[PDB]
């Protein structure tokens, strides 16, 4: 996001406003703003890996813009569109990756690729050497907003079960 | 495996008649060792379980959203108002006798996925099979019935 | 794929209600909560399935094989 230091309304503000996002929602639900159409009029700007050494970033769109759960300058130029987007494909599946040890997240990221489920829909027609398809895939009850864009909810991996954490004496 | 690197395998299988059972008559799908929790130190798994329970109760599907304001306290309050123990602990009965279990057990729904390593593909034995041509030793490979 | 039959945990027959469950969310614009509650699923074991089921035969069948 590009942030204009100047503001007639006062202190500082990122240029985009509510009208633009309303137009975006309207365009989407029509089933004519595109991401490109956001680019042209100067609302978001691409940043290569080199520039960051000359830019200050605001994590939240409200972190310091104006004047128990958890722990939370005035010269920002760009604000992150959303922090949860620093992940990749596989890690996006992990629910609450913040709330566990990082190597455990790495273990899961590597392992999830070794899970069955569905891989396409034409498989009844598509020959192949190897193929796994399970009976009753279920979209997990827990989920993040991301994998909706990953079409994951459409093509789930496993199915949830009623687990119990106990030592029932044998195995 | 879970969604948190907590891999594992099946040891044995019981059926309902002797599996531990709750007051409402629900019986668990599978049970894991509590000791697997602290050493690996995966906490988010438990939050997933609790949130999944409350989501199933309300019917409204839950959220993960790595960096957001959702905390455990709201989950506990909502689950409690739905009429269960706030932290998810549950009275539990022993199928063999029906007696009360002295402790309580954390217990709810959780997502799993099946892995690629079925035992049948990995069992292999050999006794006086084919020999290798060059060196007269047993051949290589399970598929080729090697040693 | 076809909605499962005979809920895993408990065993109550599920699937007969599935098509009823769909129209409850179409012309009655209720929530899934009240939908199932009127549908009559006290235990959540019978209920997790209806929540998380993903139809795929809908996508499959709309091919044109032969």
């Amino acid at each position: 996001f590009i942030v204009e230091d100047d503001e007639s309304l006062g202190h500082k503000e990122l240029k985009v406003r509510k009208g633009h996002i309303a137009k975006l929602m309207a365009t989407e639900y029509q089933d004519e703003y595109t991401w490109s159409s956001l680019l042209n009029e100067g609302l978001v700007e691409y940043i290569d890996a080199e520039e960051e050494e000359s830019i200050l970033i605001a994590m939240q769109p409200e972190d310091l813009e104006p004047a128990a759960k958890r722990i939370r300058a005035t010269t920002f130029t760009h604000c992150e569109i959303h922090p949860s987007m620093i992940l990749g494909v596989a890690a996006s599946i992990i629910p609450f990756p913040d709330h566990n040890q990082s190597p455990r997240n790495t273990y899961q990221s590597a392992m999830g690729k070794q899970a069955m489920g569905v891989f396409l829909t034409n498989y009844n027609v598509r020959m192949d050497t190897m193929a796994n398809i399970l009976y009753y895939p279920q979209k997990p009850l827990g989920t993040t907003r991301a994998m909706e864009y990953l079409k994951f909810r459409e093509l789930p991996a496993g199915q949830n079960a009623i687990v119990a954490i106990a030592c029932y004496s044998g195995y | 495996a879970s969604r948190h690197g907590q891999k594992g395998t099946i040891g044995i299988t019981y059926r309902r008649e002797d599996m531990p059972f709750t007051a409402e008559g629900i019986v668990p799908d599978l049970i894991i060792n509590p000791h697997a929790i602290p050493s690996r130190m995966t906490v988010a798994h438990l939050i997933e379980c609790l949130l999944s329970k409350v989501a199933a109760l309300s019917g409204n599907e839950g959220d993960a959203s790595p960096f957001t304001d959702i905390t455990v306290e709201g989950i506990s309050k909502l689950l409690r108002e739905h009429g269960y123990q706030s932290r998810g602990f549950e009275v539990m009965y022993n199928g063999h006798t029906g007696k009360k279990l002295m402790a309580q057990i954390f217990f709810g729904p959780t997502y799993y996925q099946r892995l690629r390593h079925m035992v049948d593909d990995k069992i292999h034995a050999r006794a006086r099979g084919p020999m290798q041509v060059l060196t007269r030793q047993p051949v290589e490979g399970r598929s080729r019935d090697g040693g | 794929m076809i909605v499962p039959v005979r809920c895993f945990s408990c065993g109550k027959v599920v699937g007969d209600k599935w098509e009823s469950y769909l129209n409850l969310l179409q012309e009655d614009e209720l929530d899934e909560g009240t939908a199932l509650s009127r549908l009559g699923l006290k235990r959540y074991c019978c209920r997790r399935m209806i929540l998380t089921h993903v139809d795929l035969i809908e996508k499959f069948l709309r091919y044109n094989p032969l």
């Binding site: 639900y29 | 959220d63 709201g74 989950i75 309050k77 | 929530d31």
Partner: peptide
């Protein structure tokens, strides 16, 4: 104190459709 524990896609779809 829900703090938005849940999100619905079809409900938001219908709400913004009637909003339009």
């Amino acid at each position: 104190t829900n703090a938005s524990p849940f999100i619905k896609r079809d409900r938001m779809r219908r709400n913004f459709l009637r909003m339009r």
